[model samples]
Every structure is written in structure tokens, then in C-alpha cells.
Target: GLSDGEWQQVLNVWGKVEADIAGHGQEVLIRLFTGHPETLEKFDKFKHLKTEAEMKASEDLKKVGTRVLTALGGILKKKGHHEAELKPLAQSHATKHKIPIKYLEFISDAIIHVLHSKHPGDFGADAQGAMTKALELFRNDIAAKYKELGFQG
Candidate 1:
């Protein structure tokens, strides 16, 4: 529902947040795909398959890519934390806005997949777990923010 300028502001904020996080060794990018259920379903299916298999089996990569980017943008806005102090901001936003907690987990998985594709290196359990924990912390902060913003849900 954002107007063109508002959307650009969103992108600018997201880029800044991503840059801050990436500075801490997180390689992040956003891709936007269609939001149709069928498209999402195909993406879920293809994400686990080999790249060759995915390319051969689905014609909806572009859609999936778009959705991923859009979703990541949202996550960056609502969940990005440059400093530990920023965690509370993310939680407050989520709580005040009633953002679903599931999105945090979903976006985390998306990030993992993106990293896997780009890095092709093992992050190991510790690194993956740390990212997940970071996301969880961000989710909590956003939830608190939503509450502070007068979200009822």
C-alpha cells in the first residue's frame, strides 16, 4: 500500500539495515516473488531440490525469487538489528503491529537458502544457530514494538 516514494524509503532503510548486518559477516539479499499460494508451494518444493532439478521442474523461479526478495525486505525492516540495543525496536514493532512470529522463522530459512546458494560453504551449526537466535530476538523486539504501536492483535 506504500506509494512510490514511500516504497523507495522502505528500500533505502532496508539497504542500510542489510549493510549493517552484512558488516557483521552476514551476506544478505532480497528477492521478490509472487504471493500466490501455488507459487509459494512450488517455491517450497523447489527450494530443497538441487538447482538443476529446480530449474528443470519449475517455471516459477522468477515468481519465487520476487517473493523471496519482498519477504526479505519486510524482515529487514521489522527484524534487522545492527546493535544489540536495536533488538527491542524490532520486538516492539512486531508486538505493536501484531506481526506473526512465524515470519521470523520463515525468513530465517529463506536467508539460509540464499546464503547456501551464494556461498556454497558450510556455515556449521554454531553459525546457523546464531542467525536463528538473532532472528528470534528480533522477532521478540518487533512484537513488543507492535504492542507499543497500539496493535490489538
Candidate 2:
């Protein structure tokens, strides 16, 4: 659970940027692919795209971006009371997509970077730290799902 200050930091930053989920999602994925191209191999539809522009215009990309925000928005709404909400997301990614939890880590980092870039004034060090810790918890939540099934990766 997040403290008052942490919750404030998260919601304030989220409210500011939630309206541009697709754009931010696009930016985060592009940053992830740029920094770690191997992560792209997870998506057959996107693995072949060589440029950010190509990814930016992808229907799949838009769908993924929207889905990300929808899930994220649900988690944020509870102000840290997210286990029941995140459980399925955690399980699905681990079981179905076989997406590496480490890749989610990178996406989390990219999202924070994008948040900082989008709301520099409001997303100061304290906010970033709060959000970072929140994402850390999120990663752990995902890990827990894997652990439940005896898959620690």
C-alpha cells in the first residue's frame, strides 16, 4: 500500500497524462524497442517494424497502447489496492504471452521516463520515486503470479 504522499504523487501525475495514453504508450514502446531491440521479438506483428514512425502508425500498436492504459488506469483507481485487479493481468502476461517479467520492468522504466518528460514540473524527484516504487510493487505482483504457478521467472 502507498502512503498519502505516494498516492498523491501517483494520482496527480496520472491525471495529467492519462488523456494521452496512446501517445505516451507509443513513446514508451519505441523507447523500449530502441534501447532493447530483442524485446521486439515478442510481438510478431511489430518485430519487423524498423522505425518508430512505422510503429507509431500501427493498428496493433494503438490497440496495445490502449489496452495498457486501460489496465493501468484500473490499477491506479484503487490508489494501491490493486491485487485483485492486477492478478489476471499478471497471470495472463506470464502464462499466455510468455512476456518476460524483465521486459515489463523495462516498460515500467520507460513509462516513468515518459511521465517525467511529459510532466516535468509536477513529476519531481519525489513523485518519480513514488511512481517507481509503485511500479516495483507492480512487478512484484506480476512475479507473485508466476511464483504461484511454480514459475519464478
Candidate 3:
């Protein structure tokens, strides 16, 4: 759980970068797939992209990234009121995508990579902790749904 100050950090940093939400997502996936190449196979489209440039030029990456960032906006602003909002996404990732539960950890780490490393001075410790906790809460629900689906992985 994030302190009030910490949640504000998530908003502050995201506010500065919201104009480039798609790029924030693009950077996260680039770092994720580049640093952990095996994860690339998880996404049908990105499995074929070997380089960051290739990912940037990818339509799937751009489209999915924008949607993810848009949804994340809802999560950041409405955590308490958004449990129902989060359910549909949980079903998509767990039942539809069938993404391995373990992969959620990698995605969380990749988010920190983009926020902490990619942004450098723009992000403070509070933003780091806030988004980390926020993602944790989000992942917890998704993981539960995956469990319901009998996804052992």
C-alpha cells in the first residue's frame, strides 16, 4: 500500500509524462524484452521484434501500449473504486491472454525500469514506491484470476 504522499508521486510523475504515455509503455517493453529476451515469446507480435527500433515501428506495440497506459490512468486515479474496473482486465490477461502469472513480475519490473531509469531526474523515490505498490495491487488481482483459471505457470 502507498502512503498518500506516495500515491501523489505516481500522479506527479505521470502528469509530466502523460503526453507521451505510448512512449512510456514502448520503453518498458523495450527494456523488458531486451533485458529478458525469453519474455519476447510471450507476445505474438513482439516475439518478432529484435530491436527497440523495430518495436517502435510496430503497430501492435503502439496500439497496445496506448491502451495499457490509458487503463493505467484509471488505476492510478481510482484505486479503491476501480476493483470492478480491474476485473475485465484481469479476465483478459488471465483467461484470454493466458499470460503466465510469473510474467507479471517482469512487467512490474519493466515499469520501474522506465520510471526510474528511463526518466532519470524526472522521477523521485516516492513515485518509484507508489507505482511499485500500485502495480503490486494490480498484479495481485490478476494473479488471483489466473489461479481461478487453473493456470499453474
Candidate 4:
């Protein structure tokens, strides 16, 4: 759960990127795949992309990226409702995609990196703290869902 101040800080940063959700979200995935090339193996849609240019031109990447940000935005707007918000996502990723919970942490880090790069002045310690706490909860909720669904990964 976030304090009132934390919520504001998180929303404030989110508001900065509200208009270009898919663009920013796509960059988050790009950054993650760039920094951790091995992580790309987790995404069948993106695993074949061997270069940045290929990733940038990928429609599948863009569509999934949009959904990722859409989900994050929905969660932030609702605040402290990750259990309800992330259940389907968790189950889908765990059962259908067989994604591991650790990947959420990687995605969280990528999102933070994207946000900070986009808003150097706004994403200071307070905003980072707020986002970190929110993402932590999101990851935890998904992890619990994975456990409940008996996903070994």
C-alpha cells in the first residue's frame, strides 16, 4: 500500500507520460532487451529480434508493450488493487506463457529506467521510491497468483 504522498508522486510521474503510453512502454521493453539480452528468450514474439532495429519495427512488440503500459496505468489509477488487477495477467503468463516471477522484477527495473530517462527532473528519489513500492506490490501479487496456480516457473 502507498501513502497519499507516495500515490501523488507515482501519479505525477505517470501523468508525464500519459499521452504516449505505448511509445514509452515500447521503450521500456527495448531498454530491458538491450540491457539484458537473455531476457528476450522469455518472449516468443520478440525472441527472434536480434537487433534494435528489428525490435523497433516489430508490431508484436509494440502491441504487447501497449498492453503492458495499459495494465500498469490501470493499476496505478486504481491503486493498491494489484491482487485483483494482476490476477488474470499472472495466470495467463504463468499458465500460457510459462513466465517466471523474476521477469517482473526485470520489467520493473526497465520501467523505472524508462521513466527516469524520460523525466530526469521529475523522477528523483521520491518518485523512484513511490514507483518501486508500487511495482514491488504488483510483482508480489503476481508471484502469489503464480504460486496459487501451481506454476513451477
Candidate 5:
């Protein structure tokens, strides 16, 4: 959990990014898949994208990007205590999708990358640190859910 000051810094920059969720979310996904092409195989819709250019051009990718950000927005808004919100998501990814828990770390990295690109100065080390804690909490919650759901990995 972030201290009050840390969370304030996180909210300060998040205020800007939340307004353009779709665009930022899409870019985050693009960067994630671009840097980690192996992860692309997990997404049925995006699995066909053989190149970074194809991923950037895919309408389905854009749609899922928005959805991913929307879910993340909900989690952040709750300050990483949205157990009910994460329940279905964690279960689906754990059992049905069989997603590795480490994928959340990759998503968090992508988020930081996009934040830096969008707010290079405002999202300084302080805010970055706060956001990192926030994301870690969310990831940890997901991991807990995975374990509870009997996900071996």
C-alpha cells in the first residue's frame, strides 16, 4: 500500500492519463506485444498478428486494449482492494485462459513505459514508485486469486 503522499502523486498523474485511456491503453498493449512477442500467442484475437505492424493495425487489438485499460482503471480506482472486481478476471485468466501470473508484471512494465512516454516529466521517480507499488498490489491480488482457483502455474 502507498502512503498518502505517494498515492497523491500517483493520482496526480493518473488524472491526466485516465482521460485518454483508450489511446494509452492501446499503446501499452502495443509496446507489451512488441517487446514480448511470445505473449501474443495468449490472445486468440491477436495471435494471428505476425508482426508488430500487424498488431498496431489490428482493430481487435485496439478494442481489447481499451478493455484492458478499463479493467485496470477499475482496479486502480479501488486502490487495489477491489477483490470482487478482480474475481471474474482472475478466474477467467487462471482457468480458461491459463495465463501465467508473470504476465501481470509485463503489463505493469508496459504501463510504466506508456506513462513515461505520456508524462515524461510529471510521472517522475516519485510517481513512478507509487504507481509501481499500486500495480504490484494489483498483481499480488491476482496471484492470490490464481492460487485460490487452483492454477498450478
Candidate 6:
């Protein structure tokens, strides 16, 4: 379980990423997990946890998820691309919080899983395209945020 401060940091990162990918497309969703092994592992575990464990984890994860979805919806409602807009601020926040890049990966995976649960269907052309776009946007956002924190790629 994450400490209070750690939970805040995680929420902060998720909010920014969600904002970046809002309505970009579904491709962003699929791309979010590609090549991110740690994120994939976390996603798998989160999705398959026992009923009791999931119930216990839900409190914190739900808080984090709510924050992220709120941010994403805010950006989408406005129909704006605020990726570059928030980059420097996110970077500074990550640095101030000393958040590891890996945690960002976890947050991204969580967002993907949550969204997939909300919108379940066969992976058709439309779904794939949308997910891909969303994921690309998310990847760029994470990269920019990491860059702000002086991370190398």
C-alpha cells in the first residue's frame, strides 16, 4: 500500500497523463501498455486480485482513478490539447515530490485498465484506432513529464 504522500504523487501524475490523452483516440490506450513491462504486470495484478484484496485496494485505487478521470474529462470537455501546456508544471511537481518514473508507468496502466473496464467490446477498427491515439498522447505526455524531471528518455 502507498503512503498518503505517495498516493498524492501518484494521483498527480495520473491526472496529468489523463488530461493529455483525453479523446485523442483509442490507440493511445493500447500504446500505453506496449513495451512497458512493469505497467503490464501491475495492470494484470490489479485486474485479477482476489475479491478481498481488490476490495481493500479499491479505496486507494479508486481515489487515484477518480482524480485521473476528472482531469481527463476536464480536458476533453474543453476540447483542447494541453499536453505542452502542463509539461513544465508536471515536471516540477514530479521533481518536488521525488516521484519515480516507474510509478508513472503504474498510474498509466491503471488508467488503461479502468477505461477498458468502462468500455468493454471487441477490439474493432474504431476501438483500436481510438485506443492507439489516446495511448500515443499519453506516451508523449509521460515523456515530457519525465523530461521535466531530468529523466533520460
Worst 10 residues of 5 by lDDT: 72-81
Cα lDDT of all candidates, in order? 0.44, 0.83, 0.76, 0.86, 0.84, 0.46
Model 1 alpha-carbon drift over 4 Å, by segment: 1-99, 120-122
Q: Provide the lDDT at 79 for model 4.
A: 83
Model 5 deviation from the true structure expressed as Cα RMSD, one decimal place: 1.3
Error of 4 at 103 (Å): 0.8
Q: So what's the TM-score on candidate 5?
A: 0.93
Alpha-carbon TM-score of each model against the true structure: 0.40, 0.93, 0.86, 0.93, 0.93, 0.46
Off by over 4 Å in 6: 1-58, 76-80, 98-110, 121-124
Clashes of each: 31, 0, 0, 0, 0, 16
Counting only residues 3 or more apart in sequence or on different chains, how many pairs clash (N, Cα, C under 3 Å) in candidate 5?
A: 0
Q: Comparing candidate 1 with candidate 5, which one achieves the higher lDDT?
A: 5
Better of 1 and 4 by lDDT: 4
Q: Which stretches of candidate 2 lie over 4 Å from their true place?
A: none
lDDT of 5 by residue, 1-153 (tens): 688887777777778777887788779988988888878889997788877678778889988888888888777877656989999989888987888878888989999889988997879988899999989888888888889899964
lDDT tens digits, residues 1-153, model 2? 678899889989988767787787788788888888888888877788988889888989777876886788778777778889988886777775787788889889888988898889989999999999888888887788888866656
Runs in model 4 lying further than 4 Å from the true structure? none
Better of 3 and 6 by TM-score: 3
The candidate, 2 or 6, that scores higher on lDDT is: 2
- What lDDT score goes with residue 58 in model 2? 91
lDDT of 1 by residue, 1-153 (tens): 233444344344345434444321222213212222222333354544443334434545544444444544555454343445454545543453333455545555656555545433334444445445545655565555555666632
Off by over 4 Å in 3: none
